[PDB]
Each structure stands twice: as C-alpha cells, then as structure tokens.
C-alpha cells in the first residue's frame, strides 16, 4: 500500500495550466524516495515547515505536477499578481501547501521533453452587451476555464484563442491568450502538494 508516484515518471508532463493531479487518500509515502530521483532546486512551503512535510500523517495528500522553467520562479506563489498564479494555477490558501521547483537529471529516463513551456497570459470574457469585459480569475485549481480554447502547448510567442459561447449562456467570447518561454537543456518541473488534515483520522503517513 505504498503511495504511487510511479505515473509521475513517464510521458510528457503537461504544461502549467493543464497540470495533472494525483490524490492519495490511503497509503504510506516516502517523499525523499522521490526527491532523490530529481535535483530539487526550490523547496518553499506555506502553513507548514519544509521539513515538516516529510513526516506527519494527513487525511489526503494531493500532488500536482507540470513543466515550469526556473526563469520565472517568481510568478508561482501567493505573492505574484501575474498570469501564472491568476489565470493558470492557483492553490488553496486555506489548507497547508508545499511547492517544489525541481529539475530532471541526465541519468533519469522516460521523462520526455515538451518542446516549450507555455502559459495562459490572459483570460477574459467579453459580454454579450456592448463592449464590457470581465477577467476570469481561477479559483481553487479550477483548471482555468479558458482551457478548452487553448491547446496543450502554445505554438508561437503570443497567440490568440477565442470561442463564442452558445447564445444564453451567454453570448460572451471566452477570449484567451497564450505565451511561451524558451526551452531549457534539462526539463525543469514544478510540483505542488496540498495536504489537508482530518477531523480525527489520518491516512497518508511517512513510510519509515
């Protein structure tokens, strides 16, 4: 009954706005048995200490993984007001939360490389009335409702994807835009753990 980080080590990991999820509600986890397989670069945690996320029992451990270069590690936190934390991926401020920004090594295999890291720059809705515009702000993980328009990876430096909602609801072009960043020699990934405790129960526990 060990936690299954196995699916994390294959394929092309998805871009930031399309982050996949792994929810573990009953298993035993040895995280350093994972982080040993990467070259950890930035371990920043809020509402629980970075060392404390290694050994304590929770109710559900949620892990999100994606490709995110170190060039813009500044955008990814509750501090930023840019597009990474506002139209792409927002993690709940209510419950504890760790955020790792790691790197793939050469000696690791079957972590294939997406061509480039892209993210949703802007996500607005242009009302069915005259010209009124309302930005779309992503709530707790929400997949960024502009995600249907934007493909898995954005093609060029700045693109423009728009769709027309069927009339009522709501006649408003769920317009979105995407922007990319240059490839780095080693795949640089970002992981987000969102642990939450229980009423009087604890499953996920440091496999020691």
């Amino acid at each position, epitope marked *: 009954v060990e936690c299954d980080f196995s699916p994390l080590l294959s394929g092309t990991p998805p871009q930031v706005y399309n982050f996949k999820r792994l929810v573990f509600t009953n298993c035993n986890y040895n995280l350093t048995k994972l982080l040993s397989l990467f070259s950890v670069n930035d371990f920043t945690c809020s509402q629980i200490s970075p060392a404390a996320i290694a050994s304590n029992c929770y109710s559900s451990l949620i892990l999100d993984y994606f490709s995110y270069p170190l060039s813009m590690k500044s955008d990814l936190s509750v501090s930023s007001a840019g597009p990474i934390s506002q139209f792409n991926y927002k993690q709940s401020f209510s419950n504890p939360t760790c955020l790792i920004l790691a790197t793939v090594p050469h000696n690791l295999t079957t972590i294939t490389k997406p061509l480039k890291y892209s993210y949703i*720059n*802007k996500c*607005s809705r*242009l009302l069915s009335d*005259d*010209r009124t*515009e309302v930005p779309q702000l992503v709530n707790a993980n929400q997949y960024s409702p502009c995600v249907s328009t934007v493909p898995s990876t954005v093609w*060029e*430096d*700045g*693109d*423009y*994807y*728009r769709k027309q909602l069927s009339p009522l609801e709501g006649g408003g*072009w769920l*317009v979105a*835009s995407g922007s990319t960043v240059a490839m780095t020699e080693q795949l640089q990934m970002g992981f987000g753990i969102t642990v939450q405790y229980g009423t009087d129960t604890n499953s996920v526990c440091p496999k020691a």
Partner: antibody
Amino acid sequence: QVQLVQSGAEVKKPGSSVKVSCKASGGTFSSYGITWVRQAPGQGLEWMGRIIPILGISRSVQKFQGRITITADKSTSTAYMDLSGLTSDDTAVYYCAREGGSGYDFFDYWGQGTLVTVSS
Amino acid sequence: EIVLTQSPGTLSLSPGERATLSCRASQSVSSSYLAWYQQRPGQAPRLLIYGASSRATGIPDRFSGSGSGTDFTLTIGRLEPEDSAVYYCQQYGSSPWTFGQGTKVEIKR
C-alpha cells in the same frame, strides 16, 4: 459587417514618425484583431503586426521590431501604428485588416489604405 | 518563413473559360492552411477562399478552392469581365504569414 476607415497620406522625412489611424466604424472592437499589411508601390503584400484591444496584446514581424509600436484605444475603439525610425524604403501603402483568432487568422474586411511617402 | 511560387502570372482567357492558379510552397505547409485573396484594380484586397477549401461569406461559387500539403490550386469555373484582378495566395500556415507573389487575370473579350 464593420467597414474600416483609415487616415490619409502622411508625407514624412527619412527619419521621422507616422501614426496611421484605423477607425472601427460601429463603436465595436469585438474579439477581433487589427493586422497591418504593407505593400510597396507596384509590389506584393507583407505582414507587419497584430493587436487585440480586448487584451492589449501586440505582436510584430522580426524585421520591423524595434521600430514599430501598434496600439489601440479600446474605449474610443480606434487602433494605430507608429512606425518610428523609418527610412526612405518604407514608402508604401499600408492596410489595416480584421483577424479571426488562432487557426483562423485570414484577413476578412480591409481598410481603404494610407500611402506613406517618406523623402525630404 | 516560406517563400512560395504562384501561377505563370498575366493570363489571357476568353469569358466562359476555366482558369487555374497554382501556389507551390518551398517549405511544407498544413494540408488546409492557405487563403486565396483577390484585389481589384485600385482598392483593398477582398478574401476569396479561406483554408484552401471553404469560400468567403458572399463569394459566388465559381471560385473553387483545392490543393493540399505543397501545391494549392484556385480554379475559377466560369469567367466574367468583373474578374480582372490580382490574386494572392497567403500561407497563414507558418510564421510570419507569407503573401504570394500574386497572379494577374486579364479577361480576353
């Protein structure tokens, strides 16, 4: 079906600045870019840049980069380029045209056109 | 960046004769990502074909669009004297979007 009405033949000097103003008759810049398109006299069209007033995003071709600023005022709904730092070789008729998005960036409705003539 | 060939250029054809315009691409482009435009003597170009297959809303379906991958052909089934114009094939397939050299149709009455 929005008719596009532009400005009028700026005569500038080799080393100047021209704000060509394309007007969105209707009051309505919807989810619709303006793409600008050169045409040297007796020659064949090029691409110069694109904007979306709905998002303020702008993009420019590589050759004309560092010399061109394409802006739009969504509220009064009027789009402009500003080809600063231009030589004598840019004496050409410039059109403004309506985008369609990502996979449908064909230029639907066009502007009348504004011949810039640049030599002292 | 894709440099592209066009048709022979100036064409002399009687009214009621089919006309073929070619658009070979030096670099491979998508099977359906090219748009044929028509500009009249002294005016702004008007969209004729989009996607190399579909027709622009309100364009008489003499102007058939076909071709895929490398060569794209615009075929005008019937010709009237109100077709005398310059036709450009633009490949909005690559980047930056490269307009065609352009072909001139002259209706021979």
